[PDB]
């Protein structure tokens, strides 16, 4: 808190103050160094945790909020990462996905759909971090005008940086070589600092918003549904947690666990016991607990990041927590710089976003279908997207096609030729070819579509000399085949 702080401490705060960090963001990160300095390392191990036997589901849902309350929601959209997986630098969210639209054109129409249809006081909020933020406000600029005007004020929420602190001191990192690597982002936990500190949460509770609407900007799933407002409203949720299963492909991800408090009475007379959901990623397992934490049917839900929080309350909370929202610390292990392995041994503090969830007394988590949680991890998912197998709702939804029966295509792409986005691009550089009635494509070295392909079954089309680039032609209909010169 208040100095008594140690002299590492003081030396963050110093630093920080200098730089002139966010005091929301000081304090919240001060309150992870006096863990980390009384010996908390952030590790969850499986003694700790209970599986979560059953949850409700969003399929029970009928029932659709009114206009009313959209007219007291914010959307907000986390818009901090760049496209570097997929070779774009840029924010990930300006990747173009489908009929020339970036992520953000789609949610950026969403929201202007709920304004015309249900709410024009419906608020959107993008949290950008210092490497976005140009790019992003002259991207709406451009396109969303509206946007725009109230950009700086309205629209755009900032990410804090955290200094890196020597493992053996607490003491902040220098890199004389690198000052930028002397910082981190916190990472997405700190939306509610930001949120707090920049002064949006009391202003967005004062003008009478009631529900924020978090997700990442990536995922194309995310969007508003009318009913789980309507159930917030009736059951009375602080927080909500949307969950799919857990996968194979998902084991190495953010699970949902459970924790008991017995409360002895205590003068009542009766015992009472209540969960409290938490979160728990990989970095806080211990490696003996590991292979636990990849049992899918043990936890079996996968934290989304789609979380509907009621904004009044999230306020009192982190009022009456000295204006912070006291997040579990993750301590992350590292190297000042990351890349060389000499350089001084850090521990990065984040906390997660997710792990809100057990800070609030209604907090709950609901069941997802799949389709809420769609990103884009490869351009192998950006080829399923452009294609037909998928097309855009009148609200600027994307869903697959009818034909496809919930099934996407399958699309397997060389990863020596179409991992990153240039490659992709020259893939389909003549066109996009019809997926919708293929259940599985596969390419292998290096091919272009021609104009008005059509894959149909099952496609593999392989070229198997690597200075050679295979082109298939105009009005191909390629058929339960596989093509090659």
């Known amino acids: 808190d208040m100095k008594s702080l140690s002299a590492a401490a003081q030396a ?23 863990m980390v300095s009384k010996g908390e390392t952030g590790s969850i191990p499986d003694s700790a945790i209970m599986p979560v036997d059953s949850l409700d589901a969003l399929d029970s849902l009928t029932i659709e909020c009114d206009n009313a309350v959209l007219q007291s929601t914010v959307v907000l959209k986390l818009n901090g990462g760049l496209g570097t997986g997929m070779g774009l630098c840029d924010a990930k969210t300006l990747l173009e996905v489908k009929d020339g639209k970036t992520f953000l054109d789609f949610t950026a129409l969403q929201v202007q759909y709920l304004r015309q249809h249900c709410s024009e006081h419906l608020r959107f909020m993008l949290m950008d971090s210092f490497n976005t933020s140009a790019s992003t406000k002259s991207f709406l600029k451009a396109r969303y005008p509206w946007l725009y005007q109230v950009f700086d004020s309205e629209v755009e929420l900032m ?29 997405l936990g700190d939306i509610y600092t930001a949120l707090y500190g920049s002064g949006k949460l009391q202003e967005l509770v004062e003008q009478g918003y009631r529900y924020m609407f978090v997700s990442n900007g990536d995922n194309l ?20 947690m949307e969950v799919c299963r857990r996968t194979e492909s998902d084991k190495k991800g953010g699970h949902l666990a459970r924790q008991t ?22 970095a806080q397992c211990p490696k003996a ?3 636990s934490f990849q049992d899918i049917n043990k936890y079996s839900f996968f934290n989304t990041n789609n979380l509907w929080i009621r904004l009044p309350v999230l306020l009192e909370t982190m009022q009456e927590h000295g204006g912070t929202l006291p997040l579990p610390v ?21 906390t997660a976003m997710g792990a809100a969830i057990a800070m609030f007394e209604s907090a709950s988590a609901i069941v997802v279908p799949r389709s809420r949680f769609a990103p884009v991890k490869t351009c192998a998912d950006l080829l399923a997207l452009r294609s037909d197998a998928y097309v855009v709702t009148d609200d600027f939804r994307l869903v697959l096609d009818d034909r496809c029966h919930g099934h996407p295509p399958v699309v397997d792409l060389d990863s020596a030729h179409y991992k990153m986005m240039n490659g992709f691009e020259k893939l389909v550089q003549h066109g996009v070819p019809s997926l919708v009635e293929c259940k599985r494509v596969t390419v ?17 089309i392989e070229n198997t000399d690597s200075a050679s680039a295979f082109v298939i032609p105009d009005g191909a209909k390629l058929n339960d085949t596989t093509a090659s010169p």
């Open 330 to 350: 993750i301590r992350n292990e590292k190297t000042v710089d990351s890349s060389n392995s000499a350089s001084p041994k850090v521990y990065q503090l984040e």
């Open 289 to 291: 607990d590991m292979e």
């Open 261 to 282: 408090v017995y409360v002895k009475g205590k003068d009542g007379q009766p015992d009472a016991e209540k969960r409290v959901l938490l979160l728990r990623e990989s």
């Open 444 to 460: 292998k070295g290096l091919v272009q579509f021609g104009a008005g392909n059509v894959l149909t079954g099952t496609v593999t």
């Open 221 to 240: 799933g995310a969007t508003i549904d009318k009913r789980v407002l309507a159930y917030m409203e009736k059951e009375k949720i602080d927080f909500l």
């Open 159 to 187: 990410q804090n940086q955290v200094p890196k602190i020597l493992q053996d001191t607490l003491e902040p990192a220098a890199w004389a070589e690198n000052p930028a690597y002397e910082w981190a982002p916190p990472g």
């Open 12 to 34: 963050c705060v110093k630093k920080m103050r200098d730089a002139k960090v966010n005091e929301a963001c000081i304090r919240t990160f001060i309150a992870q160094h006096v």
